[PDB]
């Protein structure tokens, strides 16, 4: 079979972790929710 989707599944699993670690870093430290 031709697909590169068996490569994408361990990467999209990491993109979300990166984004959530960024938004928590905003919230509990730089107080955007307080702003």
């Amino acid at each position: 079979v031709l697909m590169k989707r068996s490569i994408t599944a361990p990467l999209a699993a990491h993109i979300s972790l990166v984004n959530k670690a960024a938004v928590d870093y905003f919230f509990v430290e730089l107080h955007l929710e307080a702003h």
């Binding site: 031709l2 590169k4 990467l11 999209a12 993109i15 990166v18 984004n19 670690a21 960024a22």
Partner: protein, 81 residues
């Protein structure tokens, strides 16, 4: 594209072996900037590149994830600060 063009012939393994090693530097590139926030490229032949921090430049493959990687590297480069 020549992969999806021919898969039902005897020229299937030759093209598969060629694409599998021809796609290694690109997969090497994407494996760095997402996990270490440092981009790499050969000659600027791949288009994607990189206060308020979003004043950075930007200039088949699965384009569903390609633009996602472009922000997913800049946030690592921000968290490295």
């Amino acid at each position: 594209q020549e992969a999806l063009h021919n898969c039902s012939n005897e020229h299937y393994p030759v093209l598969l072996s060629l694409l599998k090693t021809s796609c290694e530097p690109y997969t090497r590139f994407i494996h760095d900037w997402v996990y270490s926030g440092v981009f790499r490229d050969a000659y600027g032949e791949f288009m994607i590149q990189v206060k308020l921090y979003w004043t950075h430049g930007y200039v088949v493959f699965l384009k569903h994830i390609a633009h996602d990687i472009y922000v997913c590297g800049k946030t690592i480069n921000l968290l490295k600060l």
